[PDB]
Design goal:
alpha/beta, Metallo-beta-lactamase, Chain A, Rossmann fold, 2 domains, six-stranded mixed beta sheet, 26% helix, globular, binds nickel (II) ion, hydrolase, SGC - Diamond I04-1 fragment screening, PanDDA
Length: 341
């Protein structure tokens, strides 16, 4: 059965609720982004209206084979009417095609569902600026002050400089980047750009990337691995065994691997600055864990909420334990008392 924090009161709507069978009273199913915890349950056999971004709708049609007649893509930053209710989709600064959803309820209540997001001050000047929000359904992934990480721009600087140095010292080094979902494409695109290479990958992952409206993409990616010195592999293969095996396959073109695992937060964040990050090394293989996040840090989250001043907050992440729920509720009250709303 569908949990309460996936239902929008006063509407026939649910958000990211495809794994519960037919939800009683649901006339339209919204999908915030194409990540498997959120789309779980969709397929070519789904026959209700799905509302989403253009990019999410390209992925539904080409990767999950959802029939076109049930996909309802909406433009961003545009007031639209759905089953008699005004909605707006906003950029969530998560993965490609990810949105927040503003619902303007018939009774005057305004609700923001962030989906998954990385809060940013740029959001304080979208259509959110113009009106009050009564209820916020909040991505609370990293809702504790221990969760600090650098900007995406500092992390990419590190990666470009690390890759460029290594391959200039050794022109026979290969760079490998791990992936398991959409998101974090800047990591591998920025490294390939500095090296003057295309990114090489499987047909399945190439297909996924061709659904994302990224400009000049035919210029940056390829299925011809032999022509590329930046390769993408599944995240599970980014270990010494899996990389040794890959190097065998390249037929003596390369004699060294430098590999990147973009993670979210890890506890080495609570000690080490990005500048000071070092790899794990075995022989001619080095692996860098880099803290490239597509979710809000604690401070980014707190700033957004203190700017928005919602009347009620409903967490959508970490909701399964009483200790997590109590922790989150204590921070929400702090923020409200400090800011005065
Ligand atoms: Ni996500």
């Amino acid at each position: 059965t569908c949990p309460f924090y996936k239902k929008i009161p006063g509407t026939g709507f649910t958000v990211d609720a495809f794994q519960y069978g037919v939800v009683e009273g649901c006339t339209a199913y919204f999908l915030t982004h194409f990540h498997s915890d959120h789309y779980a349950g969709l397929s070519k056999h789904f026959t209700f209206p799905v509302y989403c971004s253009e990019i999410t709708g390209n992925l539904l049609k080409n990767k999950l084979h959802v029939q076109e007649q049930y996909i309802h893509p909406l433009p961003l930053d545009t007031e639209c009417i759905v089953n008699g209710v005004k909605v707006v989709l906003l950029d969530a600064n998560h993965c490609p095609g990810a949105v927040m959803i503003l619902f303007y309820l018939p009774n005057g209540t305004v609700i923001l569902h962030t989906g998954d997001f990385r809060a940013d001050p740029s959001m304080e000047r979208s259509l959110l600026a113009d009106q009050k929000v009564h209820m916020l359904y909040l991505d609370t992934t990293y809702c504790s002050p221990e969760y600090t990480f650098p900007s995406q721009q500092e992390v990419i600087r590190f990666a470009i400089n690390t890759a460029f140095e290594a391959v200039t010292l050794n022109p026979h080094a290969l760079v490998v980047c791990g992936t398991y979902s959409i998101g974090k494409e800047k990591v591998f695109l920025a490294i390939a750009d500095v090296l003057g290479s295309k990114v090489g990958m499987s047909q399945e992952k190439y297909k996924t990337l061709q659904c994302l409206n990224i400009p000049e993409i035919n210029s940056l990616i390829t299925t011809d691995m032999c022509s590329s010195l930046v390769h993408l592999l599944p995240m599970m293969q980014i270990n010494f065994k899996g990389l040794q095996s890959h190097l065998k396959k390249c037929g003596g073109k390369y004699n060294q691997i430098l590999a990147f695992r973009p993670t979210g937060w890890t506890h080495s964040n609570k000690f080490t600055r990005i500048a000071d990050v070092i790899p794990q090394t075995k022989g001619n293989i080095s692996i860098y864990g880099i803290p490239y996040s597509e979710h809000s840090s604690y401070l980014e989250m707190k700033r957004f909420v203190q700017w928005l001043k919602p009347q009620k907050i409903i967490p959508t992440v970490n909701v399964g334990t009483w200790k997590s729920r109590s922790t989150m509720e204590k921070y929400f009250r702090e923020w409200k008392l400090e800011a005065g709303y």
